[PDB]
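Interim report, section 4.2 (structural modelling).
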Amino acid sequence: SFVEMVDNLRGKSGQGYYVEMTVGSPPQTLNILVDTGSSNFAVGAAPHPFLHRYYQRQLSSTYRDLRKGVYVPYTQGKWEGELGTDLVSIPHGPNVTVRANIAAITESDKFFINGSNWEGILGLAYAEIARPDDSLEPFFDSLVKQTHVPNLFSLQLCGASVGGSMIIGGIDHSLYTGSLWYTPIRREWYYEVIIVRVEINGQDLKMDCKEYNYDKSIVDSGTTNLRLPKKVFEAAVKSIKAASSTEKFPDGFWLGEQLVCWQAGTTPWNIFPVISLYLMGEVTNQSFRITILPQQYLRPVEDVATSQDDCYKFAISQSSTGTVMGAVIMEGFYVVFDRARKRIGFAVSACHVHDEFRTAAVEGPFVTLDMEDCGYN
Ligand SMILES: CC(C)c1cccc(CNC[C@@H](O)[C@H](Cc2ccccc2)NC(=O)[C@@H]2CCC[C@H](C(C)(C)N3CCCCC3=O)C2)c1
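Predicted structure of the assembly:
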């Protein structure tokens, strides 16, 4: 019955992926961004210039006020509002209704996006990072507690205006090819994983692997970019610059600020390297790699110019809070958040990114000694 959830996600490039949900009685329909990088379910509940619609608690007979405030500061953007509970369903999801915590957003700053078609966010990570504290049960925990939906979900995020699937409660085998490779969830707060090796065009970055996970590494569907700790970011940009020095790039391109364009169909993909991320595996001394194409880390953006060229922004950003495997890493992979078994699986997606002579891959097994030394603490 997972077929009912295939293609249940939509979005705009750089702006997240959202699924349709209803809250309250009678049901109020809202588009909700799916975010494995946080743990609060929150919806616009007051007018805002960028909201097409919002949750009206007054109109729901099943609304309950928790008489408690809340706020969430993300890496960029924040909101504040009022806690309460209500009945929640996912029309293209399992056939259930659950009473869940909901933060009614009453003020926000740089959270909602102009012209955006989503009105709220579904934090799919664990209670440990829920605001105001870990006693506010996250939506997925309520779903599993109140129904027989199995304790896992999977995400197929597709590039090119974007779509994909969130399969709630399982794995749909028609959405990926090849084998699923699993990496442990190190700790249940973020979806934290451990990266044990990095290569660019087959060349090892050769850093202390602790640097790759300083101070954590997470899988985060609510962040567009690959974000890398300062030292890793610099090494990676240096290597990518070198590989592509054939061409010249504007100022701020490598900062993700300025875009670069080529005549339509002439993007020199070949001079941009693949990036391989090796992840800790399920058995001793064993890892696997996912290989990322430049078509993933050069994000397509519309040309505000009179030209109809292919333009892109560099979708790798420097971080001061650890590695973030964002949407452009997840795109073209099928990612299984197996909460029940505390692991995350990766396989080549059915909607994989295409390149003339290279392909995104998930490959294993590899041997990697002393993998536990890669985790930060
Ligand atoms: C809440 C706690 C646990 C917390 C605190 C700090 C970091 C984290 C790690 N997860 C972050 C996500 O939950 C959050 C999700 C988000 C969605 C929509 C708007 C804003 C944030 N995303 C971000 O903060 C990102 C930082 C880089 C710029 C990102 C921008 C380009 C802006 N962005 C917004 C729309 C979705 C795609 C996107 O890329 C947002 C978690």
